[PDB]
Design an enzyme around this catalytic site. Structure first.
Site, PDB file in Angstrom:
ATOM      1  N   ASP D  56     -76.864 -93.024 -71.675  1.00 18.69           N
ATOM      2  CA  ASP D  56     -76.194 -94.153 -72.318  1.00 18.69           C
ATOM      3  C   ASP D  56     -75.676 -95.127 -71.274  1.00 18.69           C
ATOM      4  O   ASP D  56     -75.513 -96.317 -71.553  1.00 18.69           O
ATOM      5  CB  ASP D  56     -74.960 -93.716 -73.128  1.00 18.69           C
ATOM      6  N   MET D  87     -64.674 -86.683 -71.385  1.00 18.07           N
ATOM      7  CA  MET D  87     -65.790 -85.791 -71.623  1.00 18.07           C
ATOM      8  C   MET D  87     -67.066 -86.526 -71.282  1.00 18.07           C
ATOM      9  O   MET D  87     -67.170 -87.737 -71.499  1.00 18.07           O
ATOM     10  CB  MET D  87     -65.821 -85.364 -73.105  1.00 18.07           C
ATOM     11  N   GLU D 180     -71.898 -77.345 -78.254  1.00 16.28           N
ATOM     12  CA  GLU D 180     -71.801 -77.998 -79.554  1.00 16.28           C
ATOM     13  C   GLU D 180     -72.887 -77.438 -80.453  1.00 16.28           C
ATOM     14  O   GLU D 180     -74.072 -77.727 -80.216  1.00 16.28           O
ATOM     15  CB  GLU D 180     -71.978 -79.512 -79.408  1.00 16.28           C
ATOM     16  N   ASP D 244     -65.551 -82.749 -82.364  1.00 13.50           N
ATOM     17  CA  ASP D 244     -66.232 -83.960 -82.823  1.00 13.50           C
ATOM     18  C   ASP D 244     -65.842 -84.191 -84.273  1.00 13.50           C
ATOM     19  O   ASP D 244     -66.150 -83.358 -85.125  1.00 13.50           O
ATOM     20  CB  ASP D 244     -67.760 -83.834 -82.782  1.00 13.50           C
ATOM     21  N   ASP D 254     -77.925 -84.960 -91.077  1.00 15.23           N
ATOM     22  CA  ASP D 254     -76.647 -85.240 -90.392  1.00 15.23           C
ATOM     23  C   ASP D 254     -76.290 -86.709 -90.603  1.00 15.23           C
ATOM     24  O   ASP D 254     -76.907 -87.599 -90.016  1.00 15.23           O
ATOM     25  CB  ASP D 254     -76.848 -84.872 -88.907  1.00 15.23           C
ATOM     26  N   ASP D 286     -67.535 -88.613 -83.296  1.00 17.64           N
ATOM     27  CA  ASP D 286     -68.980 -88.702 -83.138  1.00 17.64           C
ATOM     28  C   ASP D 286     -69.507 -89.176 -84.486  1.00 17.64           C
ATOM     29  O   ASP D 286     -69.795 -88.378 -85.373  1.00 17.64           O
ATOM     30  CB  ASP D 286     -69.543 -87.342 -82.754  1.00 17.64           C
TER      31      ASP D 286
END
Ligand SMILES: OC[C@H]1O[C@H](O)[C@H](O)[C@@H](O)[C@@H]1O
Ligand SMILES: OC[C@H]1O[C@H](O)[C@H](O)[C@@H](O)[C@@H]1O
Ligand SMILES: OC[C@H]1O[C@H](O)[C@H](O)[C@@H](O)[C@@H]1O
Ligand SMILES: OC[C@H]1O[C@H](O)[C@H](O)[C@@H](O)[C@@H]1O
Ligand SMILES: [Mg+2]
Ligand SMILES: [Mg+2]
Ligand SMILES: [Mg+2]
Ligand SMILES: [Mg+2]
Ligand SMILES: [Mg+2]
Ligand SMILES: [Mg+2]
Ligand SMILES: [Mg+2]
Ligand SMILES: [Mg+2]
Ligand SMILES: [Mg+2]
Ligand SMILES: [Mg+2]
Ligand SMILES: [Mg+2]
Ligand SMILES: [Mg+2]
Lengths: 386, 386, 386, 386
Positions: D56, D87, D180, D244, D254, D286
Site C-alpha cells: 500500500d 501495526m 488474523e 479488526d 466478506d 478494517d
C-alpha cells in the site's frame, strides 16, 4: 468413455473459460482469451455452443465499425466450427455507471441507459440465432435499508421487463427472457434473490408467457436451499427456460466451481430430474476455472464439467431402471404420491368416514416409509457399487 | 412509556407462552398452561388477541362433548377479557401419522385425513371469528432425494389448497388462507421454503385471491435472506395477509427469540415498512420464551415483544419525519426511484438520444449515492443519538 | 461386497439406533429399544462395539440395586456377543436442572452436582473397559449476551476438567478425555464451538496430555467449516482421540444423517485422511435414523453407515495407489509442500539472492498448479469411472 | 456529541478508505488516494493512526530509491499530523505469484520469497514504530481436497512463523505477531479459519509468547460464530494483541461494512467486553466504504465507524452502572458464576453429600434464570429507552 458430442447440448459462456482470475484480493493470473479462440477450443472438446454478454464480444465503447468487425470474426468462427449461440445477455454490472443497478438504479437516466443497452443487444442476439435472453440483475439491491424502497424498485423492475416484452413483440422476434436469481454478491442483498421470488415476480408482468427463469446451482445453494427442489418447482410452473450448471461448497461467496464439484449428491439428483422431466434446453456451464490454473487447467476444468454430467446421467439412468429400485419406490409409496388425493371430489371426501371418523391413525403412523433403504440404493448406484 | 393497548393489535399463539421448553435434547422445564390462564395473562399485558392450533385448544382424540367443554371455557375467557381470535391453524406436524407430511404425505389415506382434520378446524375458526387461516407445512418435505417427487408433491399441495378453497366458498365463509414458509426443520428441506416460493405457488391455485402469505422473521433469516425485502415483495403483490414476528441469530435452528432480539436493525427496517405501508393486520408474535426461564420470565419475554415493537415504531417515525433525513433521501435520489423510467413509452425511449448516443456515462458514474450518510442518520435515530 | 467385521472397529452409541424420533415439533415414532437388544442387533450387523451416556444405560434416579441389575444385564450381552465398550460419556443436557449448563451453570450447586454425576460414570466406564471418556457441553452457552460472562465460564470449565484429571490420576485409571465441540443447538451459542476452540482450551489445562478432541462431521459443517481440514489440524496436534461420523446438509439444525449422506466428497476426503494418517481409534457413528423409518429402517440406516465407510475406503485407496494420480500429485508439487522451506536456516535464507533479489516472480507466477486435473482424477475414482 | 480524539486510539488501514471499489464483478468507482492525503484526512476526523501493507505504501517493484522517497513523504505526513503507525502487515495475496499461498504455497521457492518479502517489511515497521505485525494468510488454503496436504501445510506454516520469531529475537526488536483468521474467501477454505484454530496453532510454535491473534468481526461471523464469545476466549488466553472492527450481515462474502452496521447487538456486547476487560490496544477499523459512494461518502463512512464505537461505549457503560442491572445480574447468578466450583478441593467435593446424594435436583431445576428480563434491560439501554 463419457465423451461429449454436440448433440448433448453443452454450452459455455465466453466469460467462463475466459475468466482471467481477478478476484477481490488479487490480480489476473491469465491473459485474456480471444473469443474466436474460445469457440475453436470448446468445439474441439465437444461443446454445442457458446453464450455471451454484449461486452464480452464487443469491448465497451466500440465504434459501430469496430462492432461490425468483432461480430464478423465471431460469426466466421461459428461457421467454421458448427457452434451455435443459444443464449445471450447484457452486462449491466461491470461499468461504474451501474454501481446502484441498471433497471432499478435510483437515477432515472441510468435506468433509461440500461434499457437502451439491453435493447441493442437483443437485436444482435436475434441476429446470431439466440432463443433465450438472460437477465441477471447483479447490481439491483442494497447494502443498507434506506437506500432502496423495494416496492418502488419492483415497480421499476416490472416497468423495464414490460418494455422489453413490448419491444420483442413489436419487432416480431422469436426470443424469450429468463431471469437469473442470486441472493447476494456483489450487492449486500439482491432483489429477486431465489427461484421462488423470480417466479412470483413473473406472474405480475403484462405478458408472463414471455418470461421464465435461469436458475444457477450455486446461487440457490448460497441461500442453503435445495437446488433440485427449486428446479422441480420451476418445471411444475412451466418456466425452466435455461439453466446454469456449476458447483458450490455451501453458504459463502459464489465459487462457480466446475459442475460435479461442490455438492455431488445434489448434482446427481439434479441430473436425474432434468433427464426424467425431459428438459430439452441447453446444459449451460457458468463456471470459473480456479485462478491457480494455467490454460491447460482451463480446458481440463471445462472438459470435467461435461464429463461429470455424462457420468451422473449414466448413474441416474441405471438407478431408475433397476428393478430393485422400482420395487423400493413402491415400498416407499412414490406411486401413491402421484395419485390424486380426492378425485372423488369434496362432498365425497366429507362423507367418507374412512378418511376421519373411522381412520386408524395409529396403524397408519406405524408404517415405516423405507426411505433409508431407497437412499442407500441411490448411493450404491452413484458410487458404482451396485 | 411504551405501554401496549389492544388497539396496537398485538397477538400471541397459545403455543408461544405455553411452550413447555422441550427441545431435541431436553425435557420440559415448565408445566403446561391452561389456555384460559394464558388468555387472562396476555390480556393484562395489553395484548389484543390470541391464536391457536386445533390441538392446542382441544387435546387430540377428544370426544365431541369434551370438545364442546373446551371451547365453552375458552369462549368464556374471551368474553371476560375482550380478547379476539384473529387467526387459527391446524396441527399437521406433531402426531406420528404426519411423519412424512399431511397434504403431501406419500400415503393417500394420510392426505385425506389431513384434509378432514383441517376442514373441521376451519369451521371452529369461523365460529370464533378468525379472519385468517394459516397453513404451515412443517412436515412437507424430505431428508433424501428419492423419497419425494417434488412435482407430484406440488400437484398434491395444489389439490389440497384448491379443495379447501372450494370448501370455504361453498360454505359462504369470510375467511382467507395464508401460507407460512420455512426452509427447513423439522424436515431436511421443506416444500415452499421461502416467501417467494409461496407467492409463486399461490398464482397456480384455482382461486388465487383467497390465498396470501404469513411470513416469519426467523424463517427467512434461516436462509440468510433479507426479511424486510421479502415483506416488501409480498406487499407489492398484495398478499401480506398476516405476519409472524420474532428474532433469529442467523443461519441455524429456528430460535424463535422474542421480537427485537436477533437482527435488531432488520427489526427496525421491518417496522418502518409495515407502518409506512399501512399494514393493518395483526402484529402476531410466534416466539418461544427460552427454557431457562420460569413463568415470570415467560411474561417478561412476552411483554418485551410488544415493548420492542413500540420503541422501534417511535424511532422509525422519528427517522421518517426528520427534515434532515428527508433532505438525505432526496440526496440519494429515492424520489427518482419512485418516478417511472419511461412514461413517455417505448418509441420515445428508442428515439431519445440522451438515453444512449449522447448519454454521458462517466459523469453519471461519478455521482456518489450518499447512502452511507443516510444510513448513519438511520443508526443515530435507532440509538436515540439524534 | 463391503461387509463389515469387528476388526473394522465400527461402533455406535446406544442413543443412535435407540433414538425414538422425538424432535422439537413431534412425538416419538418408535418405541424404546432395550440396550441388550441393540447390542445383539449391532453385533449381527458386524459392529465392533457400543458407547453410552450414563442415562442411556441406567434410567435417571435408579436405586443402587436397580443400577446393578442394569449393568449386569448389559455386561451379559457384551459377553454373549463379543462387543466392546470403547467410549462412554455423561448426560449433562436432558434433565431440567442442566438448563443453563453443567460445568458452567451459573448456579454453583448445579456445577458441583454435574461433577459428581460425571465422576460416578467415569468409575463405571473404567469397569466396562472404556479407553476414552467424551464430554459434550451441549448446554454450556447462552441465548443472550449478559447471561454468561465467558471468561468466568471458561474459568469454570477449566476448573471442572482439571478436577476430573486430578480424579483419574489419583485413581490410577487408564482413561483419557475427549472434548466434543458443537457451535450451537440447543443453546444459541455453545462454548468451545469448533475443533479449534477446543484444541486451544486444552493447552490451558493443568495436565494437557490427558485431553484431546472428539470432532463430529456435522458439527463442524454447521459452521460451514471444512471437516477434513479440522481433522488434519487435530492429527497434527496429536489430539484426535475419537471421532463421530455422520452426515449433514450444510448450515442448519444438526441432522445427524447416516455417514456418507450429506457432503459426500467431504466424506471421501475424510476417509482418505484417516486411513493415510493411520488413525487407529474407533470409527464411531453418532447418527439418527430419520423418524420416517420403522425398525427395519433403523438397521438399514446403521448398516449403511458402515457400508459407505468401506466403499469410500476402497475408492480412496485406489486413488492413492493409481500411478497416474502419483504423477499428478508431483505435477501439483505436493512433494515440494512436504519439504522444508528453509532447512538451511535463517541466515542462509537472508543471504540467498535467489529467494528475493534474483527471484523471477513472473516465471513463478506463470506456473499452473494443475489442481483441476488432479481433482477430476479424484472424482473419477470416487464415482468408479477410472 | 460523540466526537473522537486521538486518545480513543482509533486507527484505519490505508487500504480501507483507499479501497477503489473494484469487486469481482465491477471496475473501480473511485480514484486512488495518495497515502499522504489519507493520513491528513483521517487526522482531521480524529483518528489516532494508520496501518499499512508493504504494497500500500511502496508500489510493488519499486527501486530502493523510489522506496526511500515513498517512506520519507509518509514520515513527513505523520510528523505533520501527530499520527502513529501501531501495526503493519505484508501483502502476500495480490500478486499472481501468491495464487497458491505464501507461507504454504506448494512451490518451495515461492515460500522462500514470501518469507523474504515479510522480513523486509518487519524492518520498516519497526522503523516506523509499529508494535504489532499482523499476518493474514488469505491465500493459504485450497479449493479441492487433494491440492493441499493440510498436515504438511501446517508444518510449513509453523516453520515460517518460527523463522520470523527467530529473526525478531536475533535483531532485538520489540514487536509481536498477530495472526488474523478468516474461514474462506478468496480460497475455498482458508487454513486456521477461526480464532480458535489460530489460538491452538500458536501453542505449537517455538516461542508462543511472541504470537497472538487479530480477530475480525466479520470473519468470525462468516462462520456464524459469536464474535464477543471468541474475543472472550482470546482475552482469557492472554492473546488479544490487536482487533479488526467492522460489520457483516451474516454468512456470505466478506462485506467489511462500517463498524456498527451488520449485527448491531453483537457490536454492543463486543464494546462492553473490550471496555470491561480493559483492552488497551488500537481500535482498528478494517472496513470498505461501499463502492456506491464518492469521496465525501468515504469520509462519512469512516467517521461513522468511530461515532458508533463511542455511542455503544456510552450505552454499555450506562448498562453496567445501572443499579437495576446490577440487581438483575445477581438475580441471574452472574456473581455465582465467578466463584470457584470447588475451592474446597476434590476430596471435599467427593465427601459432600449436598453435591449429590442429598442434592434436591427438582428444586434446583425449578429456579428461573431471569435472563429475559436482564436482556430486555440491555435492549432498553442500547436503544436509549431506559
Ligand atoms: O447473466 C449471465 C451471467 O452474468 C454474470 O456473469 C454472472 O456472474 C452469472 O451468474 C450470470 O449467469
Ligand atoms: O402455523 C402456526 C405455527 O405452527 C407451528 O407452531 C410453527 O412452528 C410456527 O412457525 C407456525 O407459525
Ligand atoms: O457426547 C455424546 C453425544 O451426546 C449427545 O448425544 C450429542 O447430541 C452428541 O453429539 C454427542 O456425541
Ligand atoms: O492483514 C491485513 C488485512 O489484509 C487484507 O486487507 C484483508 O482483507 C484484511 O482482512 C486484513 O486485515
Ligand atoms: Mg453466478
Ligand atoms: Mg455464480
Ligand atoms: Mg449464472
Ligand atoms: Mg416458526
Ligand atoms: Mg420459527
Ligand atoms: Mg410461525
Ligand atoms: Mg451431534
Ligand atoms: Mg450432531
Ligand atoms: Mg456427537
Ligand atoms: Mg477482512
Ligand atoms: Mg473482512
Ligand atoms: Mg482484517
Amino acid at each position: 468413455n463419457y465423451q461429449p458430442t454436440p448433440e448433448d447440448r453443452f454450452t459455455f459462456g465466453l466469460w467462463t473459460v475466459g475468466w482471467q482470475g481477478r478476484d477481490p484480493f488479487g490480480d489476473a493470473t491469465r491473459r485474456a482469451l480471444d473469443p474466436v479462440e474460445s469457440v475453436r477450443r470448446l468445439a474441439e472438446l465437444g461443446a454445442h455452443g457458446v453464450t455471451f454478454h454484449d461486452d464480452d464480444l464487443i469491448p465497451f465503447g466500440s465504434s459501430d465499425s469496430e462492432r461490425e468487425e468483432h461480430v464478423k470474426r465471431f460469426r466466421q468462427a461459428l461457421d467454421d466450427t458448427g457452434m451455435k449461440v443459444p443464449m445471450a445477455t447484457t452486462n449491466l454490472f461491470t461499468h461504474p455507471v451501474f454501481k446502484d443497478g441498471g433497471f432499478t438504479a435510483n437515477d432515472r437516466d441510468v435506468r433509461r441507459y440500461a434499457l437502451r443497452k439491453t435493447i441493442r443487444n437483443i437485436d444482435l442476439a436475434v441476429e446470431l440465432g439466440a432463443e433465450t435472453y438472460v437477465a441477471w440483475g447483479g447490481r439491483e439491491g442494497a447494502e443498507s435499508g434506506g437506500a432502496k424502497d423495494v416496492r418502488d424498485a419492483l415497480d421499476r423492475m416490472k416497468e423495464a421487463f414490460d418494455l422489453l416484452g413490448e419491444y420483442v413483440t413489436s419487432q416480431g422476434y422469436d426470443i424469450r427472457f429468463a431471469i437469473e436469481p442470486k441472493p447476494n454478491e456483489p450487492r449486500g442483498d439482491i432483489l429477486l434473490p431465489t427461484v421462488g421470488h423470480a417466479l412470483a415476480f413473473i406472474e405480475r408482468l403484462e405478458r408472463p408467457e414471455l418470461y421464465g427463469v435461469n436458475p444457477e446451482v450455486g446461487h440457490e445453494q448460497m441461500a442453503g436451499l435445495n437446488f433440485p427442489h427449486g428446479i422441480a418447482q420451476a418445471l411444475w410452473a412451466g418456466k425452466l427456460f435455461h439453466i446454469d450448471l456449476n458447483g458450490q461448497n455451501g453458504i459463502k461467496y459464489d465459487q462457480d466451481l466446475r459442475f460435479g464439484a461442490g455438492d455431488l449428491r445434489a448434482a446427481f439428483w439434479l441430473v436425474d430430474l432434468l433427464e426424467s422431466a425431459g428438459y430439452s434446453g441447453p446444459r449451460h456451464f457458468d463456471f470459473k476455472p480456479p485462478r491457480t490454473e494455467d490454460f491447460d487447467g482451463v480446458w481440463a476444468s471445462a472438459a470435467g464439467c461435461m464429463r461429470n454430467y455424462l457420468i451422473l446421467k449414466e448413474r441416474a439412468a441405471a438407478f431408475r431402471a433397476d428393478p430393485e429400485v422400482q420395487e423400493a419406490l413402491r415400498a416407499s409409496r412414490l406411486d401413491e404420491l402421484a395419485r390424486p388425493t380426492a378425485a372423488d371430489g369434496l362432498q365425497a371426501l366429507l362423507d367418507d368416514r374412512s378418511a376421519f371418523e373411522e381412520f386408524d391413525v395409529d396403524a397408519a403412523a406405524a408404517r415405516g416409509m423405507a426411505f433409508e433403504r431407497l437412499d442407500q440404493l441411490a448411493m450404491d448406484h452413484l458410487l458404482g457399487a451396485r
